[PDB]
Amino acid sequence: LKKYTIDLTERAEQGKLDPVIGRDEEIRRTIQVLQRRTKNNPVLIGEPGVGKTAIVEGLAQRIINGEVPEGLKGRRVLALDMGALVAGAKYRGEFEERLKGVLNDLAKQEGNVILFIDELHTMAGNMLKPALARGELHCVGATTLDEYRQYIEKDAALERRFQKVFVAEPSVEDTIAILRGLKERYELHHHVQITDPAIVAAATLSHRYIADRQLPDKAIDLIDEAASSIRMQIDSKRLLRNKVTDAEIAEVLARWTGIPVSRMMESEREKLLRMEQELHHRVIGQNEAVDAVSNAIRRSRAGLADPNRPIGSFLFLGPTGVGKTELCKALANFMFDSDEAMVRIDMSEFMEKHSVSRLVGAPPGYVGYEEGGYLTEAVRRRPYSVILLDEVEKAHPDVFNILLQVLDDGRLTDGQGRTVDFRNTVVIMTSNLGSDLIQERFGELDYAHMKELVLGVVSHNFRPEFINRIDEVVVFHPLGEQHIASIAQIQLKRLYKRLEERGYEIHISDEALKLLSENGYDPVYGARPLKRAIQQQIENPLAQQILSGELVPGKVIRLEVNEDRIVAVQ
Amino acid sequence: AVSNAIRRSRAGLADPNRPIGSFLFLGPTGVGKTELCKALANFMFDSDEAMVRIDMSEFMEKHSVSRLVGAPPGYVGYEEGGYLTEAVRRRPYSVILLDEVEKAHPDVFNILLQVLDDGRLTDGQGRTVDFRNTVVIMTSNLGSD
Ligand SMILES: Nc1ncnc2c1ncn2[C@@H]1O[C@H](COP(=O)(O)OP(=O)(O)OP(O)(O)=S)[C@@H](O)[C@H]1O
Ligand SMILES: Nc1ncnc2c1ncn2[C@@H]1O[C@H](COP(=O)(O)OP(=O)(O)OP(O)(O)=S)[C@@H](O)[C@H]1O
Ligand SMILES: Nc1ncnc2c1ncn2[C@@H]1O[C@H](COP(=O)(O)OP(=O)(O)OP(O)(O)=S)[C@@H](O)[C@H]1O
């Protein structure tokens, strides 16, 4: 009744509404739907964040400013609150006398009140249905595109009374103009200086890095949060910024989606040129693999990466034991500081056609639909990741197609329908396909010979549609004598750290490191023979003296050599 | 010949019982099949991503059909519609890219006959959807050799 004078036009009269910009064809349709004699009820429908509550706040800022037609001049936009009409309506028929007491004194103005039911689908609200049809209330609803479907589309006699005046998500060029007219609201709440580089590069950066939101709600937020970060650094304890710049926008996105465009200029760019030194600390050999990996991480940090495809999509073809999933563990240890920070997926677990429903999730109406699948879910959670599709050698095209879109255009949709973007991820696919051809025919193949053998899967798979998408087919060579002599003192260095925590300190001999480098050398089995020679020649002799109290903690366990048999003595 | 079906019918002067264009884009790899669906969607709607791109990701299954048309009534994903059906109810004039359509199950085409001739695909909820104004492109890789 008169507990409801909720005047959205006096909020616009007192300057308490944000200025709306450039939706002059959805307001012009909102106006002209509101000016017809039967069911003048527009419904600003559209995705969340798009700008459809802030069209009625641009009606209210045009009605109060006289940019409307002169039959709509001097109206009143009134935001009807569903919550305030149902609150306290405990007794029977209190809500109906409350709503009729609204409908009565909407009629007393004789059509000079434009009602605004924001979040229209909340209309307890059973009885407006005849008055909405005659044009007795001018009722701008503004519900989303999925909440109109599951409430108002269910009442098929109620969605007749409403004209959807669909509010499309604006472009980047329409969001920069939206943002150039809104920054004086955020330059004045935060007392900062949002510069025009921080607006062109906040509707650009959020329009590409953000996919879970709309368009006008992402760029506007970034600037809202970069300004509240600058005001934080203005206050808390020239050199300081009074000014939101385009680098401050990227810092707000770097810690919100993974990696910025601009935080690099100090010591991260030093350790990106030191990447092949940092990756060779754990993957010795395979310069052609470490260079092809580190170039793709440099191509993205320089902003040079194709923004539609992933950062890098590699196929790691080689023999066994040569470091194909050691590179992907040394890559994720480089950029995420943990080996188990890949989205690693052993491809050998899905040998069936039904096993492709665990990477994308079950379709609507099945078990495990509501849980997604752990490729698209683990990438929707953390969008900048490394995806290890380890041991990628299956005989099913249905499970391979999934990667037809991950690697080209960088998208892959849930069973739930949510499209997950892979354009910021590094997809690595380490199979074993040139194995008996890299070993024998090594030299001047230049990935043109083992790539025929990954091409020639086409009796089953590896369709040329798929190899055309992967960015680097990578040559992994077998390990030589000098390589496994240096994977020795990696796995040896990895063993003393397993013993300092026990409290035992080991010195290695210069021949004991030469025994494992000649006993654990096998050309066909890579570096796992050395990984087994250590756990057979120097760890089983250690454990019969670590258990048996023969080796006290603290004294230096000298790994001397007996008659070609490594002995642990203190 | 994709700017001839949108040229026959801008206001609509094609057959008004079948879509604006139904195209199979057959070819080798890397030739521009999916790029024509992003240069046409950029021409009509001023954005490459302004088409209904259904990759045939998980379309081989024995029921992925309910992914792009919707679950049956009373099932778990029922109230969220289907991917193809809701995107054309929401905007009837779109481009629909069906990427690598041969990599889908034959049960996918058995509901995709209804959009190609009748121009109208009923869904799992049970409402009929006008595809008579959309452009349905099916890129595929058959005949590549
Ligand atoms: N054309 C515009 N001009 C100025 N600000 C805009 C414009 N469109 C959107 N905004 C701003 O975008 C933000 C969110 O938009 P809203 O319209 O309030 O929410 P919405 O789009 O209605 O989505 P909801 O959550 O379903 S109400 C607000 O800060 C608005 O001021
Ligand atoms: N080039 C290398 N540099 C350092 N360690 C290596 C190298 N190659 C193998 N290793 C070691 O051997 C193991 C790695 O084997 P993986 O590389 O995971 O198997 P793969 O080489 O990828 O081939 P597979 O059997 O087809 S998975 C780990 O213990 C690594 O420490
Ligand atoms: N005719 C063309 N004109 C311009 N760019 C092209 C053309 N053909 C291919 N390209 C480029 O090649 C890339 C991949 O080609 P796409 O057309 O996307 O894939 P496709 O040609 O449809 O074939 P697939 O793998 O079977 S889906 C595109 O991103 C373009 O950059």
XYZ file of C-alpha atoms in Angstrom, chain A residues 237-560:
324
model
C 52.444 0.716 4.775
C 55.591 8.679 -7.813
C 56.870 5.372 -6.432
C 53.305 4.678 -5.300
C 50.424 4.731 -7.752
C 47.583 7.181 -7.424
C 46.638 5.715 -10.761
C 45.114 2.455 -11.977
C 47.194 1.651 -15.021
C 47.063 -1.204 -17.505
C 49.664 -3.156 -15.549
C 47.515 -2.947 -12.411
C 44.607 -4.530 -14.270
C 46.767 -7.476 -15.283
C 47.922 -7.926 -11.710
C 44.275 -8.271 -10.702
C 43.793 -10.976 -13.330
C 47.100 -12.761 -12.736
C 45.992 -13.832 -9.259
C 42.455 -14.638 -10.400
C 42.924 -16.937 -13.393
C 46.579 -17.940 -13.341
C 48.991 -15.733 -15.347
C 48.913 -12.030 -16.370
C 50.279 -10.308 -19.381
C 52.589 -7.866 -17.547
C 53.972 -9.032 -14.162
C 57.181 -10.303 -15.711
C 59.688 -7.461 -15.773
C 61.786 -8.221 -12.654
C 63.025 -11.797 -11.973
C 60.462 -14.051 -13.613
C 61.822 -12.961 -16.964
C 65.269 -13.913 -15.713
C 64.066 -17.414 -14.879
C 62.249 -17.742 -18.193
C 65.473 -17.352 -20.128
C 66.916 -19.781 -17.599
C 64.149 -22.257 -18.365
C 66.258 -24.739 -20.308
C 68.732 -24.619 -17.459
C 65.907 -25.106 -14.996
C 64.297 -27.916 -16.953
C 67.631 -29.656 -17.522
C 68.161 -29.827 -13.771
C 65.650 -32.667 -13.784
C 65.487 -33.736 -17.443
C 68.970 -34.187 -18.753
C 69.248 -34.842 -22.426
C 66.493 -33.958 -24.868
C 67.428 -30.394 -25.629
C 65.029 -30.585 -28.579
C 62.237 -31.382 -26.102
C 63.183 -28.842 -23.478
C 63.633 -26.177 -26.152
C 60.293 -26.995 -27.737
C 58.607 -26.818 -24.345
C 60.326 -23.671 -23.109
C 59.676 -21.806 -26.346
C 55.953 -22.244 -25.832
C 56.126 -20.925 -22.304
C 58.125 -17.973 -23.580
C 55.683 -17.466 -26.457
C 52.869 -17.016 -23.963
C 54.686 -14.770 -21.477
C 55.666 -12.478 -24.309
C 52.023 -12.340 -25.346
C 53.013 -13.887 -28.666
C 50.879 -17.011 -28.321
C 47.916 -17.583 -30.632
C 45.130 -16.549 -28.251
C 42.665 -19.072 -29.675
C 44.739 -22.251 -29.374
C 46.429 -23.520 -26.207
C 49.783 -22.196 -25.052
C 51.414 -25.338 -26.334
C 50.210 -28.728 -27.503
C 53.082 -31.208 -27.712
C 53.412 -34.856 -28.611
C 56.302 -36.495 -26.801
C 57.300 -39.463 -28.930
C 60.252 -41.482 -27.798
C 61.469 -44.725 -26.310
C 60.803 -45.785 -22.757
C 62.664 -44.251 -19.872
C 63.918 -41.193 -21.747
C 62.087 -38.490 -19.874
C 58.804 -37.975 -21.669
C 56.780 -37.708 -18.483
C 59.804 -36.469 -16.633
C 59.687 -33.350 -18.734
C 56.029 -32.850 -17.902
C 56.819 -33.269 -14.254
C 59.777 -30.913 -14.530
C 57.617 -28.482 -16.475
C 54.888 -28.367 -13.856
C 57.553 -28.167 -11.172
C 58.992 -25.207 -13.012
C 55.844 -23.163 -13.405
C 53.752 -24.387 -10.466
C 56.526 -25.518 -8.070
C 55.173 -29.048 -7.643
C 55.525 -32.189 -9.756
C 51.911 -33.163 -9.087
C 50.508 -29.907 -10.427
C 49.679 -31.263 -13.838
C 46.207 -32.198 -14.828
C 47.689 -35.593 -15.476
C 45.461 -38.171 -17.072
C 46.801 -41.583 -17.885
C 45.293 -42.234 -21.256
C 45.692 -45.972 -20.766
C 42.731 -45.957 -18.378
C 40.195 -45.238 -21.121
C 40.625 -48.084 -23.607
C 36.879 -48.188 -24.260
C 34.483 -45.854 -26.071
C 32.561 -45.218 -22.850
C 35.725 -44.100 -21.063
C 35.529 -40.724 -22.781
C 32.734 -39.757 -20.393
C 35.125 -39.276 -17.499
C 37.097 -36.492 -19.136
C 33.957 -34.513 -19.985
C 31.364 -35.980 -17.617
C 28.086 -37.757 -18.144
C 25.341 -36.242 -20.316
C 22.144 -34.743 -18.882
C 20.100 -37.405 -17.190
C 22.780 -39.911 -16.212
C 24.762 -40.923 -13.164
C 27.654 -38.643 -12.443
C 26.185 -35.893 -14.565
C 26.340 -33.424 -11.705
C 30.040 -34.093 -11.037
C 31.505 -33.135 -14.395
C 34.638 -34.744 -15.704
C 38.097 -34.202 -14.384
C 39.625 -32.780 -17.508
C 37.124 -30.004 -17.984
C 36.558 -29.546 -14.269
C 40.226 -29.400 -13.332
C 40.808 -26.861 -16.116
C 37.721 -24.818 -15.299
C 39.025 -24.576 -11.729
C 42.594 -23.592 -12.558
C 42.699 -22.295 -16.135
C 46.482 -22.049 -16.451
C 47.712 -25.596 -15.999
C 49.699 -28.324 -17.726
C 47.638 -31.215 -19.016
C 49.545 -34.460 -19.227
C 47.655 -36.894 -21.433
C 50.138 -39.556 -20.496
C 50.568 -42.726 -22.583
C 48.330 -41.470 -25.365
C 47.987 -44.613 -27.456
C 44.367 -45.748 -27.736
C 42.339 -47.298 -30.556
C 39.141 -45.260 -30.262
C 38.309 -42.201 -32.426
C 35.446 -41.229 -30.103
C 37.857 -40.661 -27.213
C 40.343 -38.927 -29.518
C 37.898 -36.384 -30.947
C 37.750 -34.783 -27.502
C 41.220 -33.490 -28.254
C 40.160 -32.252 -31.669
C 38.825 -29.132 -29.971
C 41.127 -28.909 -26.990
C 44.120 -28.389 -29.263
C 42.427 -26.346 -31.986
C 40.401 -23.321 -30.763
C 41.010 -24.416 -27.188
C 37.530 -25.250 -25.965
C 35.924 -28.383 -24.574
C 32.437 -28.533 -23.109
C 31.149 -30.434 -20.075
C 28.391 -32.945 -20.221
C 26.615 -30.210 -18.276
C 27.121 -27.934 -21.280
C 29.612 -25.550 -19.694
C 32.353 -24.741 -22.189
C 35.805 -24.853 -20.589
C 38.536 -22.878 -22.307
C 41.910 -24.515 -22.842
C 43.529 -21.496 -24.418
C 45.770 -20.884 -21.409
C 46.831 -24.458 -20.792
C 49.735 -26.591 -21.985
C 48.505 -29.931 -23.311
C 51.239 -32.555 -23.383
C 50.688 -35.969 -24.949
C 53.488 -38.434 -24.250
C 53.177 -41.650 -26.224
C 55.586 -44.430 -27.132
C 55.160 -44.643 -30.849
C 58.498 -44.274 -32.574
C 60.108 -46.464 -29.928
C 61.535 -49.284 -32.034
C 62.355 -46.798 -34.818
C 64.025 -44.027 -32.817
C 66.344 -46.587 -31.242
C 67.638 -48.212 -34.406
C 67.411 -45.407 -36.974
C 68.803 -42.532 -34.964
C 70.167 -39.588 -36.951
C 68.843 -36.917 -39.364
C 65.219 -38.035 -39.173
C 64.232 -34.534 -37.984
C 60.776 -35.708 -36.757
C 59.910 -36.706 -40.331
C 60.365 -40.440 -39.852
C 58.823 -41.270 -36.486
C 56.072 -38.873 -37.501
C 55.149 -41.212 -40.304
C 54.778 -43.917 -37.678
C 52.490 -41.720 -35.593
C 50.730 -40.870 -38.852
C 50.325 -44.584 -39.798
C 48.028 -45.370 -36.944
C 45.149 -44.608 -39.348
C 44.012 -48.228 -39.493
C 42.795 -47.338 -35.981
C 43.551 -43.689 -35.085
C 46.021 -40.811 -34.977
C 43.889 -39.344 -37.777
C 45.695 -36.592 -39.693
C 43.014 -34.215 -38.440
C 44.596 -34.771 -35.010
C 48.308 -34.524 -35.854
C 47.592 -31.324 -37.746
C 46.496 -29.757 -34.470
C 49.459 -30.594 -32.246
C 52.015 -27.832 -32.225
C 55.205 -29.821 -31.715
C 55.809 -33.433 -32.460
C 58.926 -33.748 -30.340
C 61.898 -36.060 -30.884
C 62.951 -37.856 -27.710
C 66.224 -39.621 -28.152
C 67.507 -42.649 -26.260
C 69.888 -42.044 -23.423
C 73.615 -42.464 -23.929
C 76.365 -43.525 -21.588
C 77.122 -39.959 -20.549
C 73.450 -39.235 -19.934
C 72.775 -42.105 -17.564
C 76.059 -41.232 -15.874
C 74.385 -37.915 -15.023
C 70.948 -39.321 -14.231
C 72.956 -41.276 -11.672
C 73.830 -38.183 -9.660
C 70.259 -36.958 -9.962
C 68.807 -40.144 -8.504
C 71.768 -40.254 -6.143
C 71.073 -36.665 -5.098
C 67.457 -37.724 -4.731
C 68.555 -40.581 -2.477
C 70.676 -38.591 -0.018
C 67.718 -36.285 0.588
C 65.774 -39.424 1.462
C 68.531 -40.118 3.979
C 69.250 -36.706 5.492
C 65.667 -36.856 6.730
C 66.504 -40.276 8.150
C 69.688 -38.764 9.533
C 72.216 -40.653 7.409
C 74.762 -38.873 5.239
C 76.247 -40.583 2.188
C 79.402 -39.929 0.251
C 79.545 -41.730 -3.101
C 82.792 -43.065 -4.554
C 84.077 -42.185 -8.010
C 83.859 -45.828 -9.099
C 80.584 -46.585 -7.336
C 79.048 -43.816 -9.400
C 80.782 -45.487 -12.354
C 79.349 -48.920 -11.542
C 75.750 -47.683 -11.589
C 76.583 -45.758 -14.748
C 77.624 -49.053 -16.359
C 75.292 -51.530 -14.658
C 72.282 -49.281 -14.947
C 73.048 -48.476 -18.561
C 70.693 -50.272 -20.910
C 70.042 -48.662 -24.306
C 66.605 -50.145 -24.851
C 65.093 -49.418 -21.446
C 66.158 -45.829 -20.897
C 67.018 -44.613 -17.420
C 64.861 -46.964 -15.437
C 67.652 -49.617 -15.313
C 69.767 -47.083 -13.428
C 66.757 -46.291 -11.283
C 66.651 -50.026 -10.581
C 70.407 -50.433 -10.202
C 70.351 -47.841 -7.430
C 67.503 -49.529 -5.619
C 69.177 -52.938 -6.014
C 72.893 -52.272 -5.620
C 72.965 -49.361 -3.152
C 69.557 -49.436 -1.419
C 69.159 -53.098 -0.601
C 72.722 -53.084 0.802
C 71.773 -49.935 2.681
C 68.573 -51.289 4.200
C 70.230 -54.414 5.580
C 72.537 -52.052 7.468
C 70.089 -49.261 8.233
C 67.665 -51.714 9.800
C 70.317 -53.913 11.416
C 71.982 -51.032 13.276
C 75.190 -51.625 11.344
C 75.139 -48.004 10.183
C 74.742 -45.395 12.913
C 73.144 -42.061 11.911
C 75.601 -39.203 11.660
C 78.691 -40.977 10.387
C 79.422 -40.543 6.698
C 78.354 -43.653 4.802
C 81.173 -43.995 2.301
C 79.915 -45.937 -0.708
C 83.153 -47.746 -1.465
